[PDB]
């Protein structure tokens, strides 16, 4: 006879779920539309029209949608597959119907780990930062809404830092000092709860300097010194101090607390007689030299030297 019946699906739409762990060729859904108008015209030919985006395919005669060749399914991905049941009458006398498949990609067994907003974090702290002061909230959220367990794993042997098990706030647990340790680099972890479900991340704490160390003089350098009389710019002796702080806070500058019209001092701390010294006038000069770090909010140190002038 003629073509008299339209190839029809039983439903309008299909919600079906797909996973990350799937491989090419794995069956997604068997769609079967009835035409039942027997002839060439009773014989159906399926086809995805649009919305597969290269990650899906249907077998023409069977009506079976499968994962396409060579594709990796990204998680949390929407797809809407319009699939067309075409009957095999001539093009003139053809009939068509449509059906839409609504798919979402999931994680393997639908449970990713909890993920951090970043893979690395760069912090900065002053060694002077108050104990208990919060450094960083590590709010790593969990796709499925599971409860999170935070904890540091490596990079903190001291436990100088405390990461709240529940809240993910990173407080400071013991007092910082920069000379002890100049920077910490932690490894931190969120837990889904099961072993498969745990992400990692790295925090890079960098401690910055305060002037909390006065320049200390070398203990062994000579304090009891000699000089020749009747000589301007004559060498007397040398002092030396150091500062375990850094920057301008590390640089030491030598100054004289007395006798600065008589004696002078260099950048390096060498002391010279600025004028023609004399034994008949003054054979005991008890001089005090001062080291001051060249810093904002500076610190001082003193050293009384014992200079006794000789003649020859």
Nearer to Ca ion among residue 3 and residue 273 (C-beta): 3
Nearer to Ca ion among residue 180 and residue 260 (C-beta): 180
Nearer to Ca ion among residue 35 and residue 55 (C-beta): 35
- Neighbouring CB atoms inside 10 A of 295's CB total 18
Return the exposure string of 24-61: e unless at least 16 CB atoms fall within 10 Å of the residue's CB, then b. eeeebbebebebebeeebbebebebeebbeebbbbeee
Nearer to Ca ion among residue 64 and residue 248 (C-beta): 248
Would you say 289 and 302 are in contact if contact means Cβ atoms under 8 Å apart? yes
Site for Ca ion, rule CB under 5 A: 3, 5, 35, 37, 41, 87, 111-112, 142, 144, 146, 177, 179, 192, 209, 211-213, 243, 245, 249, 293, 299
Q: How far apart are CA 242 and CA 189, in angstroms?
A: 42
In the complex, minimum distance from the CB of residue 214 to Ca ion, in angstroms, rounded to a whole number: 6
Nearer to Ca ion among residue 52 and residue 113 (C-beta): 113
In the complex, minimum distance from the CB of residue 49 to Ca ion, in angstroms, rounded to a whole number: 19
Helix, coil or strand: residue 164: coil
106 CB burial (10 A radius; 0-12, 13-18, 19+)? buried
In the complex, minimum distance from the CB of residue 145 to Ca ion, in angstroms, rounded to a whole number: 8
In the complex, minimum distance from the CB of residue 186 to Ca ion, in angstroms, rounded to a whole number: 21
Would you say 264 and 233 are in contact if contact means Cβ atoms under 8 Å apart? no
Would you say 292 and 299 are in contact if contact means Cβ atoms under 8 Å apart? yes
In the complex, minimum distance from the CB of residue 303 to Ca ion, in angstroms, rounded to a whole number: 16
């Amino acid at each position: 006879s003629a073509n008299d019946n339209t190839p029809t699906f039983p439903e309008i739409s299909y919600d079906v779920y797909v996973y990350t762990d799937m491989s090419p060729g794995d069956s997604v859904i068997q769609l079967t539309a009835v035409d039942a108008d027997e002839g060439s015209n009773g014989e159906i030919s399926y086809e995805i029209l649009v919305g597969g985006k290269g990650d899906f395919v249907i077998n023409k005669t069977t009506g079976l949608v499968s994962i396409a060749p060579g594709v990796e399914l990204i998680v949390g991905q929407t797809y809407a597959l319009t699939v067309q049941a075409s009957d095999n009458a001539p093009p003139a006398e053809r009939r068509h119907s449509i059906c839409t498949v609504y798919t979402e990609v999931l994680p393997p067994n639908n449970q990713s780990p909890p993920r951090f907003p970043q893979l690395m974090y760069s912090l900065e702290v002053s060694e002077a930062m108050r104990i208990g002061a919060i450094l960083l909230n590590l709010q790593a959220t969990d796709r499925e809404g599971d409860p999170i367990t935070y904890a540091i794993e490596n990079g903190d042997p001291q436990r100088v830092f405390n990461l709240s098990e529940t809240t993910g706030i990173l407080s400071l647990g013991k007092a910082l000092d920069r000379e002890s340790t100049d920077r910490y680099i932690l490894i931190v972890t969120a837990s889904d709860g099961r072993p498969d479900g745990t992400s990692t991340a790295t925090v890079n704490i960098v401690v910055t300097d305060v002037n909390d160390n006065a320049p200390v003089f070398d203990p062994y350098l000579p304090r009891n010194l000699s000089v020749v009389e009747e000589e301007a710019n004559a060498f007397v002796g040398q002092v030396r101090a150091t500062d375990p702080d850094a920057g301008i806070n590390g640089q030491v500058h030598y100054s004289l607390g007395n006798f600065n019209n008589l004696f002078r001092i260099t950048s390096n701390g060498s002391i010279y007689t600025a004028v023609k010294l004399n034994r008949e006038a003054r054979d005991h000069y008890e001089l005090v030299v001062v080291a001051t770090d060249g810093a904002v909010h500076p610190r001082h140190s003193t050293l009384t030297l014992y200079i006794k002038v000789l003649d020859i």
